[PDB]
């Protein structure tokens, strides 16, 4: 989001309450659960009004408190993790014995 | 009631539809294991300057 | 160093119990209550006779 990235858990992503969509890169996507942004406010049982609730960017940044950031900018280069390997040193030579 | 042009007194229904347009979405992308490239750098204690 | 972001969405959910008041020109509040005494000594009804 907004030139930033994080390695979130898949289920946690699927759980958070924001209107998602198919993400097929087509135009005019249809968003599911639109009620999470609009807020209708019946004042005195006289009439009804609609609000859009503004930008969730700051709240989303807070809701990533345990995530690990990576460098998506440039080449999607992940710089967090670990790896295990074993080293076969049978073929090495010292180059200095002689 | 009568003040709103309706003869019957009571509670009336009401709907409010509004077209919702999205600006600046958030993309979520998976990674497949046939396109992941680890990189290991190995350096010998050559004693280089 | 990274700026956190825009706290409007978090503010809107941090105000989830507050009461809205219309603010355009005069800040005409519409929620509240008032206690008033009604002194009806001088008050009469038309056409009793």
């Amino acid at each position, epitope marked *: 989001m907004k030139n930033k990235a994080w390695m979130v858990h898949r289920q946690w992503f699927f759980d958070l309450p924001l209107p998602w969509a198919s993400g097929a890169t087509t*135009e*005019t996507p249809t968003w599911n659960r639109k009620e999470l942004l609009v807020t209708f406010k019946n004042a005195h049982a006289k009439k009804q009004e609609v609000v*859009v609730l*503004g930008s969730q960017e700051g709240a989303m940044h807070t809701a990533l408190t345990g995530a690990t950031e990576i460098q998506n900018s440039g080449g999607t280069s992940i710089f967090a993790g670990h790896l295990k390997c074993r080293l076969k040193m049978d073929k090495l030579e010292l180059k200095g014995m002689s | 009631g009568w003040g709103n042009g309706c003869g019957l007194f009571g509670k009336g229904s009401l709907v409010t539809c509004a077209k919702f*347009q*999205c*600006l*600046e*979405p958030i993309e979520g992308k998976v990674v497949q294991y046939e396109n992941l490239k680890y990189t290991v750098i190995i350096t010998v204690h050559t004693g280089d300057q | 160093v990274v700026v956190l972001g825009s706290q409007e969405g978090a503010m809107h959910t941090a105000l989830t119990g507050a009461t809205e008041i219309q603010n*355009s*020109g005069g800040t005409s509040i519409f929620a509240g209550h008032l206690k008033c005494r009604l002194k009806m000594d001088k008050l009469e009804l038309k056409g009793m006779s």
Partner: antibody
Framework: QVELVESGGDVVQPGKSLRLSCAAS????????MHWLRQAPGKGLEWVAV????????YYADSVKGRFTISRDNSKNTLYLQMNSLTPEDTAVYYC???????????????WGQGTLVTVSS | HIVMTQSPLSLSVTPGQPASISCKSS????????????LYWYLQKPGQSPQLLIY???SRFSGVSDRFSGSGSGTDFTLKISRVQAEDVGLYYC?????????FGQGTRLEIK
């Protein structure tokens, strides 16, 4: 933080067509309706054309209707304006206005481009 | 094709003083479905590009100084400045967004008296 920079403005003789280009940055382009506006020197601001979020829907000002064409290259994050049958009257500083960030109107202006100058004269 | 007529064409006022600009419409720009009034006020500073001061009749836009406030209900709208500074030189073009062929006003001019 959004940046709208003009391009394509230059001199041109009457009757010779010209294609204007509005490069966009700082926001997701495909979700925003875009506009073209012009200000002739010493004259009031005059809106030219609008393209909505869906590419197909377009509208033009009647004073320039039938002479211009507006296109959206949202894959490259840029806007295209095609000016045809230019008149010596059709010389002005041309602007590129974004859709409103917050509001109710489907089309409004909140951020204006730096501006380009096109001169139609002999 | 609603035509916007502005009452003042030149407003020379000393600093630290109020100012009232009027943009009178040829038709009520009050959208029936929502009850809002779509009248916008821009300011193109000399040698600059136009900004957006009040993105409605009276709800000012973000980044705008505290003093800019509007009014008006059906056709007689106003732009009130409380205390004029030296930066207020410009052209206060009003606009109506009610109808698709939206048209600006001629735009007043403000200078320091």
């Amino acid at each position: 933080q959004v940046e709208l920079v003009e391009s394509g403005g230059d001199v041109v003789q009457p009757g010779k067509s010209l294609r204007l280009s509005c490069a966009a940055s700082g926001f997701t382009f495909t979700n925003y309706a875009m506009h073209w506006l012009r200000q002739a020197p010493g004259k009031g601001l005059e809106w030219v054309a609008v393209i909505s979020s869906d590419v197909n829907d377009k509208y033009y000002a009647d004073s320039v209707k039938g002479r211009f064409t507006i296109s959206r290259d949202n894959s490259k994050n840029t806007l295209y304006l095609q000016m045809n049958s230019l008149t010596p009257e059709d010389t002005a500083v041309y602007y590129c206005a974004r859709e409103q960030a917050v509001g109710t109107n489907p089309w409004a202006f909140d951020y204006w481009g730096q501006g380009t100058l096109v001169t139609v004269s002999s | 094709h609603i035509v916007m007529t502005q009452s003042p064409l030149s407003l020379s006022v000393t600093p630290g003083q109020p100012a009232s600009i009027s943009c009178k419409s040829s038709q009520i720009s009050s959208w029936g479905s929502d009850g809002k009034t779509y009248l916008y006020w821009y300011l193109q500073k000399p040698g600059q590009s136009p900004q957006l001061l009040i993105y409605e009749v009276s709800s000012r836009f973000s980044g705008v100084s505290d003093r800019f406030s509007g009014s008006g209900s059906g056709t007689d709208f106003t732009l009130k400045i409380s205390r004029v500074q030296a930066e207020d030189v410009g052209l206060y073009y009003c606009m109506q967004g009610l109808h698709l062929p939206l048209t600006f006003g001629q735009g007043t001019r403000l200078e320091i008296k």
